[PDB]
Amino acid sequence: MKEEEMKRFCKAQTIQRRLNEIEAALRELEAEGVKLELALRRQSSSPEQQKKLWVGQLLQLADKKNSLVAEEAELMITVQELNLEEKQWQLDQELRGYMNREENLKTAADRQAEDQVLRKLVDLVNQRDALIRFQEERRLSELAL
Amino acid sequence: TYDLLFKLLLIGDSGVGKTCVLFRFSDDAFNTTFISTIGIDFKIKTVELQGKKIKLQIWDTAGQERFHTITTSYYRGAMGIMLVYDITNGKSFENISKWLRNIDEHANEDVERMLLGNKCDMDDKRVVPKGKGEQIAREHGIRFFETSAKANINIEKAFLTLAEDILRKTP
Numbered sequence: 001m002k003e004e005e006m007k008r009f010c011k012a013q014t015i016q017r018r019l020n021e022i023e024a025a026l027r028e029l030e031a032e033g034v035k036l037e038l039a040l041r042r043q044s045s046s047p048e049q050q051k052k053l054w055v056g057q058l059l060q061l062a063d064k065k066n067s068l069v070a071e072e073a074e075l076m077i078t079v080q081e082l083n084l085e086e087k088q089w090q091l092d093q094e095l096r097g098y099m100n101r102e103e104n105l106k107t108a109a110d111r112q113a114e115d116q117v118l119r120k121l122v123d124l125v126n127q128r129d130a131l132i133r134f135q136e137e138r139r140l141s142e143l144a145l
Numbered sequence: 146t147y148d149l150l151f152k153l154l155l156i157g158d159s160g161v162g163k164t165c166v167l168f169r170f171s172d173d174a175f176n177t178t179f180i181s182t183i184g185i186d187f188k189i190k191t192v193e194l195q196g197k198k199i200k201l202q203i204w205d206t207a208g209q210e211r212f213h214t215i216t217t218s219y220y221r222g223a224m225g226i227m228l229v230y231d232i233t234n235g236k237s238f239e240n241i242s243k244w245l246r247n248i249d250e251h252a253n254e255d256v257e258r259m260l261l262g263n264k265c266d267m268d269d270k271r272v273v274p275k276g277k278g279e280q281i282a283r284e285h286g287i288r289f290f291e292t293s294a295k296a297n298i299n300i301e302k303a304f305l306t307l308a309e310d311i312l313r314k315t316p
């Protein structure tokens with residue numbers, strides 16, 4: 001399946017598009033928040049009804065921001081996962097090239113190159129694994145109140 | 146967004162269907178072309194068991210002997226290990242004894258072990274009777290399923306049964 005090269009690329013473009021939308025939305029949200037908190041302090045005097053409508057609007061903004069920021073955090077890890085998966089796929093293809101050649105025809109430099117690519121491949125799997133462990137330690141961390 | 150992370154590991158001779166067994170579990174598809182696993186790999190699959198979202202990190206080893214020292218460094222982290230042979234390949238099953246010895250040597254003492262006889266869709270070409278599998282599992286006191294990645298027989302059941310054994314001792 002070279003289907004998976006194309007699927008990985010499309011998923012990466014899709015996530016980048018969503019990341020661009022979240023960045024714009026957080027920018028808007030922070031400006032709206034700044035505006036309403038200036039209103040509440042400057043109009044230290046206006047109807048309590050309109051004040052509680054402004055605090056209500058800052059509480060809905062607060063929840064929308066938390067949602068956006070948490071979605072953004074998940075997507076940023078997925079971007080790095082797809083980036084590692086693509087590098088792993090590149091070494092897999094190179095190493096598969098070396099391995100499908102007759103051993104009679106391999107110089108000493110060829111065999112050393114083949115070994116080096118194998119060690120880089122294994123290290124990329126270990127890098128993907130470190131990302132799993134980063135998520136696990138954040139899960140343990142976020143449970144702490 | 147998930148409750149628990151479980152580390153699983155598939156081992157067994159090259160060609161028994163380890164990568165296919167995983168691809169059926171994680172993508173409900175089957176590929177007939179043999180692409181031999183180079184060194185080591187893993188996939189992620191999240192499942193729901195007893196109201197818990199469990200994140201499965203399933204390590205897939207190369208069965209070829211040149212990759213042996215690479216694969217042995219991943220035994221110690223495993224919480225469950227599927228030992229896979231091919232019901233049409235006699236030597237794959239006689240090698241189950243050796244794979245069990247590798248677990249004795251490199252894996253945590255309390256690892257959950259499960260025996261899978263894959264390719265159970267090729268009854269016409271069976272060499273290993275289901276009862277030999279049953280008997281060796283009984284001798285080691287471990288679970289045994291006959292599986293098929295091609296026909297989707299007992300794949301989900303094997304993985305979720307092993308995950309439930311890990312979960313049942315989690316507290």
Ligand SMILES: Nc1nc2c(ncn2[C@@H]2O[C@H](COP(=O)(O)OP(=O)(O)NP(=O)(O)O)[C@@H](O)[C@H]2O)c(=O)[nH]1
Binds near residue numbers: 180
């Ligand atoms: N009929 C049948 N063929 C299967 C089944 N599972 C796998 N195969 C076939 O058997 C071959 C080996 O599959 P594969 O998953 O790569 O085996 P493996 O254990 O990962 N080999 P390796 O350790 O070298 O990576 C493939 O051609 C695959 O299509 C099955 O349930 N039924």
Ligand SMILES: [Mg+2]
Binds near residue numbers: 180
């Ligand atoms: Mg494989």
